[PDB]
């Protein structure tokens, strides 16, 4: 019913849907847990000798400033053929390990090049990722990486013909962004739907006179592997009055595996809000943005500006034929890129909690009703009924670890009878009812 490793901190949680096995990324530790929260394997991951001025492998002659450094886990994703682990040490290099046999190593390049620094090398920065596959069945890895001290989003080979080139990205398989410390992405999550991959994050809206941080959803084709179809849309949760997106989830349940509505928690720069964003409207507005920037020079039919090129790339919206939309739905070498909407996507809060910083969101369905499991910075887990007639107030609240923020990696078990809830010191298997 609990897992509390004495003397270390938790960072990430992954669940193998085939197996039920849980995987924990911790400071200097990887644990494999059975669904019953029973320990099945441990793997030490640090400390090591490191500096952030230094490139792996770290050696005393080239890096005398090296020092004992802990290894907070930075990414932890289940792949078709392996478990993907990236730490925050050694420039965020990754490895792959056997599913169910966490202790044995499958793949790990012996001399990683500067194209294979995957995760964030600063534990105070986040890394988000998403496994997907190529048109040829190749397995790929989408990675969002916040600014530290490397492109903010990349598509990398998980099992390429040479194993040493693993986790590398091709020259066009990244989002080229210039003033990375000024934009200063903070990633929240990444998810797939249909033919697309999506990234939720925070960055500075340099288009705005105040240059304040702003939440965005962002979309790319899965086959593409080129970022030609990259398009960002700002989020407006009460017009952006709750500006800092913290966590989101799509409904997951025995009836609907993955829902069509994104439930996101936002925080004010204090109070929090829950805001729904229908995914067809998300796709509607990115479609408009792409369509306008391709064929009407970034403008609506009445001439109002609706789309532009972000990230200072030397690209422009154009006057391409309407046929380009059908001939190049995921873009091309010379279509305008990367694109953004001037028009936000709006949501009216379905909750407003005046003294709460939400940090985690899970949503499920019970006999047709939508329930939301919402964690906060204080280590509380709330339960809220989201259907018609709702109070907005939680019908239930439970302390997981006082003072210690609940982790985004809320996950249900295969039957949805339990929620796996995590703080910096403990992981619970919490029943959904009684």
């Amino acid at each position: 019913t609990a897992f509390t490793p004495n003397g270390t901190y938790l960072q990430h949680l992954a669940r193998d849907p085939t197996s039920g096995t849980l995987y924990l990324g911790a400071t200097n530790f990887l644990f494999q847990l059975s669904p019953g929260l029973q320990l099945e394997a441990t793997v030490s991951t640090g400390p090591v000798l490191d500096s952030r001025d230094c490139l792996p492998p770290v050696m005393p002659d080239e890096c005398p400033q090296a020092q004992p450094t802990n290894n907070p886990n930075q990414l932890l994703l289940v792949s078709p053929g392996a478990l993907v682990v990236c730490g925050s040490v050694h420039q965020g290099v990754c490895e792959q390990r056997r599913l169910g046999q966490l202790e044995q190593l499958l793949l790990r390049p012996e001399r990683p090049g500067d194209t294979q620094y995957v995760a964030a090398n600063d534990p105070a920065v986040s890394t988000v990722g998403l496994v997907a596959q190529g048109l040829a069945g190749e397995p790929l890895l989408f990675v969002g990486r916040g600014y530290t001290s490397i492109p903010p989003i990349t598509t990398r080979a998980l099992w390429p013909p040479d194993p040493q080139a693993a986790f590398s990205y091709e020259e066009t398989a990244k989002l080229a962004v210039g003033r990375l410390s000024e934009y200063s992405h903070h990633f929240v999550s990444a998810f797939a739907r249909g033919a697309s991959a999506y990234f939720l994050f925070l960055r500075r809206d340099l288009q705005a006179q105040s240059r304040a941080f702003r939440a965005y959803v962002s979309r790319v084709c899965l086959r593409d592997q080129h970022y030609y179809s990259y398009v960002e849309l700002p989020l407006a949760c009460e017009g952006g009055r709750y500006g800092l997106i913290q966590a989101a989830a799509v409904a997951t349940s025995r009836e609907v595996a993955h829902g069509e509505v994104l439930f996101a928690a936002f925080s004010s720069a204090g109070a929090s809000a829950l805001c729904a964003f229908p995914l067809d409207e998300v796709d509607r507005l990115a479609n408009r943005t792409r369509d306008a920037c391709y064929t009407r020079e970034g403008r609506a039919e009445d001439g109002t500006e609706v789309a532009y090129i972000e990230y200072d790339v030397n690209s422009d919206c154009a006057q391409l034929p309407v046929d380009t939309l059908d001939a190049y739905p995921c873009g091309s070498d010379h279509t305008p890129s990367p694109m953004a909407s001037r028009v936000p996507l709006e949501a009216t809060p379905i909750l407003e909690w005046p003294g709460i910083q939400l940090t985690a969101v899970a949503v499920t369905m019970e006999d047709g009703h939508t329930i939301a499991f919402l964690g906060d910075s204080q280590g509380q887990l709330h339960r809220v009924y989201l259907g018609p007639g709702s109070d907005g107030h939680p019908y239930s609240t439970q302390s997981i670890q006082q003072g210690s923020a609940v982790s985004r990696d809320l996950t249900f078990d295969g039957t949805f009878e339990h929620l796996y809830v995590m703080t910096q010191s403990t992981l619970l298997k919490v029943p959904v009812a009684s």
Partner: peptide, 16 residues
């Protein structure tokens, strides 16, 4: 007013 989630469909009801 505030949106709610429609029972069974998960579709969002914008006004109650």
């Amino acid at each position: 007013x505030r949106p709610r989630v429609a029972r069974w469909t998960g579709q969002i009801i914008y006004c109650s």
